[PDB]
Amino acid sequence: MYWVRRKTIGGSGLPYTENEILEWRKEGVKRVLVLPEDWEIEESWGDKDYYLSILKKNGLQPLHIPIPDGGVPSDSQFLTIMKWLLSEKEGNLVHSVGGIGRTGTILASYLILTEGLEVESAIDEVRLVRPGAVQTYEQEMFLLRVEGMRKSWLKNIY
Amino acid sequence: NKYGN
Ligand SMILES: [Ca+2]
């Protein structure tokens, strides 16, 4: 697990055991944005709802927003994601399977909108703690698209 | 995707 903005917003891959969730708690994680698709979660845990219930059982508030591996969120999902991440400032954890592609993309987009950074700077900030963040052309194109419509996005988010 | 470095 890594913090992009200390105790405010960080990223991670898909945990394998509950003990890893306890470590998240020790680091200050309070809320979790789950990005992998059902099958990806089932692949590791055996059942998607069981995994989500386990996050709740251990005192974390989860939101499941399924994004295809190597892909990006739809506009509807992104609005939902940004409102979720902004509704509660501290302890936000975003995770995918590897904690590099979808996670890096969301975290970078977050910085683009909240800190007014260019795509290059946003990815730079994420790669400082998570090397290789943002993997695909579509993910890169999504970020450029978000930067180009920052005003429109901020307008809809706030 | 393609994880495991
Ligand atoms: Ca791929």
Side-chain angles (χ1 to χ4, degrees):
Chain A
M1 193 212 97
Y2 54 88
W3 285 117
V4 169
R5 290 291 175 263
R6 183 76 179 301
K7 312 296 182 185
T8 289
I9 191 165
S12 177
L14 169 66
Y16 196 43
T17 65
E18 294 188 64
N19 207 162
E20 279 172 84
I21 304 297
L22 298 178
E23 291 297 318
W24 288 354
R25 290 180 51 80
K26 296 182 183 183
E27 299 300 345
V29 173
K30 303 189 183 71
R31 315 170 74 232
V32 186
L33 175 58
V34 184
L35 307 186
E37 296 194 300
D38 289 7
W39 66 271
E40 291 180 288
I41 296 172
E42 298 185 67
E43 184 65 291
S44 291
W45 289 79
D47 182 271
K48 183 265 293 185
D49 281 353
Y50 174 91
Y51 171 61
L52 295 178
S53 73
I54 245 53
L55 293 178
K56 287 184 170 183
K57 185 188 68 172
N58 291 113
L60 297 182
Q61 304 162 300
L63 185 64
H64 189 199
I65 307 299
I67 301 309
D69 194 3
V72 301
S74 60
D75 282 347
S76 290
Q77 288 182 309
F78 187 54
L79 174 63
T80 300
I81 285 174
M82 286 302 98
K83 282 183 162 300
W84 162 268
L85 294 174
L86 266 22
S87 68
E88 295 290 3
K89 178 187 179 183
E90 294 178 349
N92 291 296
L93 180 61
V94 177
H95 89 72
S96 43
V97 170
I100 301 174
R102 288 164 286 187
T103 298
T105 301
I106 291 306
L107 296 173
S109 68
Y110 178 92
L111 297 174
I112 289 175
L113 298 180
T114 62
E115 287 172 38
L117 305 182
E118 298 183 300
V119 175
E120 218 271 3
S121 290
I123 298 178
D124 253 43
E125 289 292 281
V126 182
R127 287 184 174 183
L128 297 180
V129 294
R130 166 20 81 188
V134 183
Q135 293 179 300
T136 73
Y137 277 58
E138 198 183 11
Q139 297 178 333
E140 181 170 358
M141 291 192 245
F142 168 74
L143 290 171
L144 278 45
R145 174 174 169 291
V146 173
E147 175 186 2
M149 302 185 291
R150 182 187 285 90
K151 306 303 297 175
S152 177
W153 276 112
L154 292 173
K155 183 178 181 180
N156 279 291
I157 296 175
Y158 295 81
Chain B
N1 57 136
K2 198 73 174 184
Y3 303 112
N5 127 267

Coordinates of all heavy atoms in Angstrom, one line a residue, chain A residues 40-115:
Chain A
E40 N -12.4 -10.9 -11.2 CA -11.1 -10.7 -10.7 C -11.1 -10.9 -9.2 O -10.1 -11.4 -8.6 CB -10.6 -9.3 -11.0 CG -10.3 -9.1 -12.5 CD -9.9 -7.7 -12.8 OE1 -10.7 -6.7 -12.7 OE2 -8.7 -7.5 -13.1
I41 N -12.1 -10.3 -8.5 CA -12.2 -10.5 -7.0 C -12.5 -11.9 -6.7 O -11.8 -12.5 -5.8 CB -13.3 -9.6 -6.5 CG1 -12.9 -8.1 -6.7 CG2 -13.5 -9.8 -5.0 CD1 -14.1 -7.1 -6.4
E42 N -13.4 -12.5 -7.4 CA -13.8 -13.9 -7.2 C -12.6 -14.8 -7.3 O -12.4 -15.8 -6.6 CB -14.9 -14.4 -8.1 CG -16.2 -13.7 -8.0 CD -17.2 -14.2 -8.9 OE1 -17.7 -15.4 -8.7 OE2 -17.7 -13.5 -9.8
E43 N -11.7 -14.5 -8.3 CA -10.5 -15.3 -8.6 C -9.6 -15.4 -7.4 O -9.0 -16.5 -7.2 CB -9.7 -14.6 -9.7 CG -8.5 -15.3 -10.2 CD -8.8 -16.7 -10.8 OE1 -9.3 -17.6 -10.1 OE2 -8.7 -16.8 -12.1
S44 N -9.5 -14.4 -6.6 CA -8.7 -14.4 -5.4 C -9.4 -14.8 -4.1 O -8.9 -15.6 -3.3 CB -8.0 -13.1 -5.2 OG -7.0 -12.8 -6.2
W45 N -10.6 -14.3 -3.9 CA -11.4 -14.5 -2.7 C -12.4 -15.6 -2.8 O -12.8 -16.2 -1.7 CB -12.0 -13.2 -2.2 CG -11.0 -12.3 -1.7 CD1 -10.2 -11.5 -2.4 CD2 -10.7 -12.1 -0.3 NE1 -9.4 -10.8 -1.6 CE2 -9.6 -11.2 -0.3 CE3 -11.2 -12.7 0.9 CZ2 -9.1 -10.8 0.9 CZ3 -10.6 -12.3 2.1 CH2 -9.5 -11.3 2.1
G46 N -12.9 -16.0 -4.0 CA -13.9 -17.0 -4.1 C -15.3 -16.5 -4.3 O -16.1 -17.2 -4.8
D47 N -15.5 -15.3 -3.8 CA -16.8 -14.6 -4.0 C -16.6 -13.1 -3.8 O -16.0 -12.7 -2.9 CB -17.8 -15.2 -2.9 CG -19.1 -14.6 -3.0 OD1 -19.4 -13.5 -2.4 OD2 -20.0 -15.2 -3.7
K48 N -17.2 -12.4 -4.7 CA -17.1 -10.9 -4.7 C -17.8 -10.2 -3.5 O -17.2 -9.4 -2.8 CB -17.7 -10.3 -6.0 CG -17.6 -8.8 -6.1 CD -18.8 -8.1 -5.7 CE -20.0 -8.4 -6.6 NZ -21.2 -7.6 -6.3
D49 N -19.1 -10.6 -3.3 CA -19.8 -10.0 -2.1 C -19.1 -10.4 -0.8 O -19.1 -9.6 0.1 CB -21.2 -10.5 -2.1 CG -22.1 -9.7 -3.1 OD1 -21.6 -8.7 -3.7 OD2 -23.3 -10.1 -3.3
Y50 N -18.6 -11.6 -0.7 CA -17.9 -12.0 0.5 C -16.7 -11.0 0.8 O -16.5 -10.6 1.9 CB -17.4 -13.4 0.5 CG -16.5 -13.8 1.7 CD1 -17.1 -14.3 2.8 CD2 -15.2 -13.5 1.7 CE1 -16.4 -14.6 3.9 CE2 -14.4 -13.8 2.9 CZ -15.0 -14.3 4.0 OH -14.3 -14.6 5.1
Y51 N -16.0 -10.7 -0.3 CA -14.8 -9.8 -0.1 C -15.3 -8.4 0.3 O -14.7 -7.8 1.2 CB -14.1 -9.6 -1.5 CG -13.0 -8.5 -1.4 CD1 -11.9 -8.6 -0.5 CD2 -13.1 -7.4 -2.3 CE1 -11.0 -7.6 -0.5 CE2 -12.2 -6.4 -2.2 CZ -11.1 -6.5 -1.3 OH -10.2 -5.5 -1.2
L52 N -16.3 -7.9 -0.3 CA -16.8 -6.6 0.0 C -17.4 -6.6 1.5 O -17.2 -5.6 2.2 CB -18.0 -6.1 -0.9 CG -17.5 -5.9 -2.4 CD1 -18.7 -5.5 -3.2 CD2 -16.5 -4.8 -2.4
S53 N -18.0 -7.6 1.9 CA -18.6 -7.7 3.2 C -17.4 -7.8 4.3 O -17.6 -7.3 5.4 CB -19.4 -9.0 3.4 OG -18.7 -10.1 3.5
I54 N -16.3 -8.4 3.9 CA -15.1 -8.5 4.7 C -14.5 -7.1 5.0 O -13.9 -6.9 6.1 CB -14.1 -9.5 4.1 CG1 -14.0 -10.7 5.0 CG2 -12.8 -8.8 3.9 CD1 -15.3 -11.3 5.3
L55 N -14.6 -6.2 4.0 CA -14.1 -4.9 4.2 C -14.9 -4.2 5.2 O -14.4 -3.5 6.1 CB -14.1 -4.1 2.9 CG -13.2 -4.6 1.8 CD1 -13.4 -3.8 0.5 CD2 -11.7 -4.5 2.2
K56 N -16.2 -4.3 5.1 CA -17.2 -3.7 6.1 C -17.0 -4.3 7.4 O -17.1 -3.6 8.5 CB -18.6 -4.0 5.6 CG -19.0 -3.1 4.4 CD -20.5 -3.3 4.1 CE -21.0 -2.3 3.1 NZ -22.5 -2.5 2.8
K57 N -16.9 -5.7 7.5 CA -16.7 -6.4 8.8 C -15.5 -5.8 9.5 O -15.6 -5.6 10.8 CB -16.5 -7.9 8.5 CG -16.4 -8.7 9.8 CD -16.0 -10.2 9.4 CE -14.5 -10.2 9.0 NZ -14.0 -11.6 8.9
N58 N -14.5 -5.5 8.8 CA -13.3 -4.9 9.4 C -13.2 -3.4 9.6 O -12.2 -2.8 9.7 CB -12.0 -5.4 8.7 CG -11.8 -6.9 8.8 OD1 -11.9 -7.7 7.9 ND2 -11.4 -7.3 10.1
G59 N -14.4 -2.8 9.6 CA -14.6 -1.4 9.8 C -14.2 -0.4 8.7 O -14.0 0.8 8.9
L60 N -14.2 -0.9 7.4 CA -13.8 0.0 6.3 C -15.1 0.1 5.5 O -15.9 -0.8 5.4 CB -12.7 -0.7 5.5 CG -11.4 -0.8 6.1 CD1 -10.4 -1.4 5.2 CD2 -10.9 0.5 6.7
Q61 N -15.2 1.3 4.9 CA -16.4 1.6 4.1 C -16.0 1.5 2.6 O -15.2 2.2 2.1 CB -16.8 3.1 4.3 CG -17.1 3.3 5.8 CD -17.2 4.8 6.2 OE1 -16.2 5.5 6.0 NE2 -18.3 5.3 6.7
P62 N -16.6 0.5 1.9 CA -16.2 0.2 0.5 C -17.2 0.7 -0.5 O -18.4 0.9 -0.2 CB -16.1 -1.3 0.5 CG -17.3 -1.7 1.3 CD -17.3 -0.7 2.5
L63 N -16.8 1.0 -1.7 CA -17.6 1.3 -2.8 C -17.0 0.6 -4.0 O -15.8 0.7 -4.3 CB -17.5 2.9 -3.1 CG -18.5 3.2 -4.3 CD1 -20.0 3.0 -3.8 CD2 -18.4 4.7 -4.6
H64 N -17.8 -0.3 -4.6 CA -17.3 -1.1 -5.7 C -17.7 -0.4 -7.1 O -18.8 -0.3 -7.4 CB -18.0 -2.5 -5.7 CG -17.4 -3.4 -6.7 ND1 -18.1 -4.6 -7.1 CD2 -16.2 -3.4 -7.3 CE1 -17.3 -5.3 -7.9 NE2 -16.2 -4.6 -8.1
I65 N -16.6 0.0 -7.8 CA -16.8 0.6 -9.1 C -15.9 -0.1 -10.1 O -14.8 0.2 -10.3 CB -16.4 2.1 -9.1 CG1 -17.2 2.9 -8.0 CG2 -16.8 2.8 -10.5 CD1 -18.7 2.8 -8.1
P66 N -16.5 -1.2 -10.6 CA -15.8 -2.2 -11.6 C -15.3 -1.5 -12.9 O -16.1 -1.0 -13.7 CB -16.9 -3.2 -11.9 CG -17.9 -3.0 -10.8 CD -17.9 -1.5 -10.6
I67 N -14.0 -1.5 -13.1 CA -13.4 -1.0 -14.3 C -12.6 -2.1 -15.0 O -11.9 -2.9 -14.3 CB -12.4 0.1 -14.0 CG1 -13.0 1.3 -13.2 CG2 -11.7 0.6 -15.2 CD1 -14.3 1.8 -13.9
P68 N -12.8 -2.3 -16.3 CA -12.1 -3.4 -17.0 C -10.6 -3.3 -16.8 O -10.1 -2.1 -16.8 CB -12.5 -3.3 -18.4 CG -13.9 -2.6 -18.3 CD -13.7 -1.6 -17.2
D69 N -9.9 -4.4 -16.6 CA -8.5 -4.4 -16.5 C -7.8 -3.7 -17.7 O -8.1 -4.0 -18.8 CB -7.9 -5.8 -16.3 CG -6.5 -5.8 -15.8 OD1 -5.9 -4.8 -15.5 OD2 -5.9 -7.0 -15.7
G70 N -6.9 -2.7 -17.4 CA -6.3 -2.0 -18.5 C -7.2 -0.9 -19.1 O -6.8 -0.2 -20.0
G71 N -8.4 -0.8 -18.5 CA -9.3 0.1 -19.0 C -9.5 1.4 -18.1 O -8.7 1.6 -17.2
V72 N -10.6 2.1 -18.4 CA -10.9 3.3 -17.7 C -12.4 3.4 -17.3 O -13.2 2.6 -17.8 CB -10.6 4.6 -18.5 CG1 -9.1 4.6 -18.9 CG2 -11.5 4.6 -19.8
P73 N -12.7 4.2 -16.4 CA -14.1 4.4 -15.9 C -14.9 5.1 -17.0 O -14.4 5.9 -17.7 CB -14.0 5.1 -14.6 CG -12.9 6.1 -14.9 CD -11.9 5.1 -15.6
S74 N -16.2 4.8 -17.0 CA -17.1 5.6 -17.9 C -17.3 6.9 -17.3 O -16.9 7.1 -16.1 CB -18.5 4.9 -18.0 OG -19.1 4.8 -16.7
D75 N -17.9 7.9 -18.0 CA -18.1 9.2 -17.4 C -19.0 9.1 -16.2 O -18.7 9.8 -15.2 CB -18.8 10.1 -18.4 CG -17.8 10.6 -19.5 OD1 -16.6 10.5 -19.3 OD2 -18.3 11.2 -20.5
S76 N -20.0 8.2 -16.2 CA -20.9 8.1 -15.0 C -20.1 7.5 -13.8 O -20.3 8.0 -12.7 CB -22.0 7.1 -15.4 OG -22.9 7.7 -16.3
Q77 N -19.2 6.5 -14.1 CA -18.4 5.9 -13.0 C -17.4 6.9 -12.5 O -17.2 7.0 -11.3 CB -17.7 4.7 -13.5 CG -18.5 3.5 -13.8 CD -17.7 2.3 -14.3 OE1 -16.8 2.4 -15.2 NE2 -17.8 1.2 -13.6
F78 N -16.8 7.7 -13.4 CA -15.8 8.7 -12.9 C -16.4 9.8 -12.1 O -15.8 10.2 -11.1 CB -15.1 9.3 -14.1 CG -13.9 10.2 -13.7 CD1 -12.9 9.7 -12.9 CD2 -13.9 11.5 -14.1 CE1 -11.9 10.5 -12.5 CE2 -12.8 12.4 -13.7 CZ -11.8 11.9 -12.9
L79 N -17.6 10.2 -12.4 CA -18.3 11.3 -11.6 C -18.5 10.7 -10.2 O -18.3 11.3 -9.2 CB -19.6 11.7 -12.2 CG -20.5 12.6 -11.4 CD1 -19.7 14.0 -11.2 CD2 -21.8 12.9 -12.1
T80 N -19.0 9.4 -10.2 CA -19.3 8.7 -9.0 C -18.0 8.6 -8.1 O -18.0 8.8 -6.9 CB -19.9 7.3 -9.2 OG1 -21.1 7.4 -10.0 CG2 -20.2 6.6 -7.9
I81 N -16.9 8.2 -8.8 CA -15.7 8.0 -8.2 C -15.2 9.3 -7.5 O -14.8 9.3 -6.4 CB -14.6 7.5 -9.2 CG1 -14.9 6.0 -9.5 CG2 -13.2 7.7 -8.6 CD1 -14.0 5.4 -10.6
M82 N -15.2 10.4 -8.3 CA -14.7 11.7 -7.8 C -15.6 12.2 -6.6 O -15.1 12.8 -5.7 CB -14.6 12.7 -8.9 CG -13.5 12.5 -9.8 SD -11.8 12.5 -9.0 CE -11.5 10.8 -8.8
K83 N -16.9 12.0 -6.7 CA -17.8 12.4 -5.6 C -17.5 11.6 -4.4 O -17.6 12.1 -3.2 CB -19.2 12.3 -6.0 CG -19.7 13.5 -7.0 CD -21.1 13.4 -7.3 CE -21.6 14.7 -7.9 NZ -21.4 15.8 -6.8
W84 N -17.2 10.3 -4.5 CA -16.9 9.4 -3.4 C -15.6 9.8 -2.7 O -15.6 10.0 -1.5 CB -16.9 8.0 -3.9 CG -16.2 7.0 -3.0 CD1 -14.8 6.7 -3.0 CD2 -16.7 6.3 -1.9 NE1 -14.6 5.8 -2.0 CE2 -15.7 5.5 -1.3 CE3 -18.1 6.2 -1.4 CZ2 -15.9 4.7 -0.2 CZ3 -18.3 5.3 -0.3 CH2 -17.2 4.6 0.3
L85 N -14.6 10.0 -3.5 CA -13.3 10.4 -3.0 C -13.3 11.8 -2.3 O -12.5 12.0 -1.4 CB -12.2 10.4 -4.1 CG -11.9 9.0 -4.7 CD1 -11.0 9.1 -5.9 CD2 -11.3 8.1 -3.6
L86 N -14.2 12.7 -2.8 CA -14.2 14.0 -2.2 C -15.2 14.2 -1.1 O -15.2 15.1 -0.4 CB -14.6 15.0 -3.4 CG -13.5 15.8 -4.1 CD1 -12.1 15.1 -4.0 CD2 -13.9 16.0 -5.5
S87 N -16.1 13.2 -1.0 CA -17.2 13.3 0.1 C -16.5 13.1 1.4 O -17.1 13.5 2.4 CB -18.2 12.2 -0.2 OG -17.7 10.9 0.0
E88 N -15.4 12.4 1.5 CA -14.7 12.1 2.7 C -13.2 12.3 2.4 O -12.6 11.5 1.8 CB -14.9 10.7 3.2 CG -16.4 10.4 3.6 CD -16.8 11.2 4.9 OE1 -16.0 11.9 5.5 OE2 -17.9 11.0 5.4
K89 N -12.6 13.4 2.9 CA -11.2 13.7 2.6 C -10.1 12.8 3.0 O -9.3 12.4 2.2 CB -10.9 15.1 3.3 CG -9.5 15.6 3.1 CD -9.2 16.8 3.9 CE -7.8 17.3 3.8 NZ -7.5 18.5 4.6
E90 N -10.1 12.3 4.3 CA -9.1 11.4 4.8 C -9.3 9.9 4.8 O -10.4 9.4 4.8 CB -8.7 11.8 6.2 CG -8.1 13.2 6.3 CD -7.7 13.6 7.7 OE1 -8.2 13.0 8.6 OE2 -7.0 14.6 7.8
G91 N -8.2 9.2 4.7 CA -8.2 7.7 4.7 C -8.7 7.0 3.5 O -9.1 5.9 3.6
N92 N -8.6 7.7 2.3 CA -9.1 7.0 1.1 C -8.1 6.1 0.4 O -6.9 6.5 0.1 CB -9.5 8.1 0.1 CG -10.7 8.9 0.4 OD1 -11.8 8.3 0.5 ND2 -10.5 10.2 0.7
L93 N -8.5 4.9 0.2 CA -7.6 3.9 -0.5 C -8.4 3.5 -1.8 O -9.6 3.2 -1.7 CB -7.4 2.7 0.4 CG -6.5 1.6 -0.2 CD1 -5.1 2.2 -0.5 CD2 -6.4 0.4 0.7
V94 N -7.6 3.5 -2.9 CA -8.1 3.1 -4.2 C -7.4 1.8 -4.5 O -6.1 1.8 -4.4 CB -7.9 4.1 -5.2 CG1 -8.4 3.6 -6.6 CG2 -8.5 5.5 -4.9
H95 N -8.0 0.8 -5.0 CA -7.3 -0.4 -5.3 C -7.8 -1.2 -6.6 O -9.0 -1.1 -6.9 CB -7.1 -1.4 -4.1 CG -8.2 -2.4 -4.0 ND1 -8.4 -3.4 -4.9 CD2 -9.2 -2.5 -3.1 CE1 -9.4 -4.2 -4.5 NE2 -9.9 -3.7 -3.4
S96 N -6.9 -1.8 -7.2 CA -7.2 -2.6 -8.4 C -6.7 -4.0 -8.1 O -6.8 -4.4 -7.0 CB -6.5 -2.0 -9.7 OG -5.1 -1.7 -9.4
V97 N -6.1 -4.7 -9.1 CA -5.5 -6.0 -8.8 C -4.0 -5.8 -8.5 O -3.5 -6.2 -7.5 CB -5.7 -6.9 -10.0 CG1 -4.9 -8.2 -9.8 CG2 -7.2 -7.3 -10.1
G98 N -3.3 -5.1 -9.5 CA -1.9 -4.9 -9.3 C -1.6 -3.6 -8.6 O -0.4 -3.4 -8.1
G99 N -2.5 -2.7 -8.5 CA -2.3 -1.4 -7.8 C -1.5 -0.4 -8.7 O -0.9 0.5 -8.2
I100 N -1.4 -0.7 -10.0 CA -0.6 0.1 -10.9 C -1.4 0.8 -12.0 O -1.2 2.0 -12.2 CB 0.5 -0.8 -11.5 CG1 1.4 -1.4 -10.4 CG2 1.3 0.0 -12.5 CD1 2.4 -2.4 -10.9
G101 N -2.2 0.0 -12.8 CA -2.9 0.6 -13.9 C -4.1 1.4 -13.6 O -4.1 2.6 -13.7
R102 N -5.2 0.7 -13.3 CA -6.5 1.4 -13.0 C -6.3 2.3 -11.8 O -6.8 3.4 -11.8 CB -7.6 0.4 -12.8 CG -8.1 -0.3 -14.0 CD -8.9 -1.6 -13.7 NE -8.0 -2.7 -13.2 CZ -8.4 -3.9 -13.0 NH1 -9.7 -4.2 -13.2 NH2 -7.6 -4.9 -12.6
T103 N -5.6 1.8 -10.8 CA -5.4 2.7 -9.6 C -4.6 3.9 -9.9 O -4.9 5.0 -9.4 CB -4.7 1.8 -8.5 OG1 -5.5 0.7 -8.1 CG2 -4.4 2.7 -7.3
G104 N -3.5 3.7 -10.6 CA -2.6 4.9 -11.0 C -3.4 5.9 -11.8 O -3.3 7.1 -11.6
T105 N -4.3 5.4 -12.7 CA -5.1 6.3 -13.5 C -6.1 7.1 -12.7 O -6.2 8.3 -12.9 CB -5.9 5.4 -14.5 OG1 -5.0 4.7 -15.3 CG2 -6.7 6.3 -15.4
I106 N -6.8 6.5 -11.7 CA -7.7 7.2 -10.9 C -7.0 8.2 -10.0 O -7.4 9.3 -9.9 CB -8.5 6.2 -10.0 CG1 -9.5 5.4 -10.9 CG2 -9.3 7.0 -8.9 CD1 -10.4 6.2 -11.8
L107 N -5.9 7.8 -9.4 CA -5.1 8.7 -8.5 C -4.6 9.9 -9.3 O -4.7 11.0 -8.8 CB -4.0 7.9 -7.8 CG -4.5 6.8 -6.9 CD1 -3.2 6.0 -6.4 CD2 -5.2 7.4 -5.7
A108 N -4.1 9.6 -10.5 CA -3.6 10.7 -11.3 C -4.7 11.7 -11.7 O -4.5 12.9 -11.6 CB -2.9 10.2 -12.6
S109 N -5.9 11.1 -12.1 CA -7.0 12.0 -12.4 C -7.4 12.8 -11.2 O -7.7 14.0 -11.4 CB -8.2 11.1 -12.9 OG -8.7 10.4 -11.8
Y110 N -7.3 12.2 -10.0 CA -7.7 12.9 -8.8 C -6.8 14.2 -8.6 O -7.3 15.2 -8.3 CB -7.5 12.0 -7.6 CG -7.7 12.6 -6.3 CD1 -9.0 12.5 -5.7 CD2 -6.7 13.3 -5.6 CE1 -9.3 13.1 -4.4 CE2 -7.0 13.8 -4.3 CZ -8.2 13.7 -3.7 OH -8.5 14.2 -2.5
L111 N -5.5 14.0 -8.9 CA -4.5 15.1 -8.7 C -4.8 16.1 -9.8 O -4.6 17.3 -9.6 CB -3.1 14.6 -8.8 CG -2.7 13.6 -7.7 CD1 -1.3 13.1 -7.9 CD2 -2.8 14.4 -6.3
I112 N -5.1 15.7 -11.0 CA -5.4 16.6 -12.1 C -6.5 17.6 -11.7 O -6.4 18.8 -11.9 CB -5.8 15.9 -13.4 CG1 -4.5 15.1 -14.0 CG2 -6.3 16.9 -14.4 CD1 -4.9 14.3 -15.2
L113 N -7.6 17.0 -11.2 CA -8.7 17.8 -10.8 C -8.6 18.7 -9.5 O -8.9 19.9 -9.5 CB -10.0 16.9 -10.7 CG -10.4 16.2 -12.0 CD1 -11.6 15.4 -11.7 CD2 -10.7 17.2 -13.1
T114 N -8.0 18.1 -8.5 CA -7.9 18.8 -7.2 C -6.7 19.7 -7.1 O -6.7 20.7 -6.4 CB -7.8 17.8 -6.0 OG1 -6.7 17.0 -6.2 CG2 -9.1 17.0 -6.0
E115 N -5.6 19.4 -7.8 CA -4.4 20.2 -7.7 C -4.0 21.0 -9.0 O -3.0 21.7 -9.1 CB -3.2 19.4 -7.3 CG -3.3 19.0 -5.8 CD -2.3 18.0 -5.3 OE1 -1.1 18.1 -5.7 OE2 -2.6 17.2 -4.4

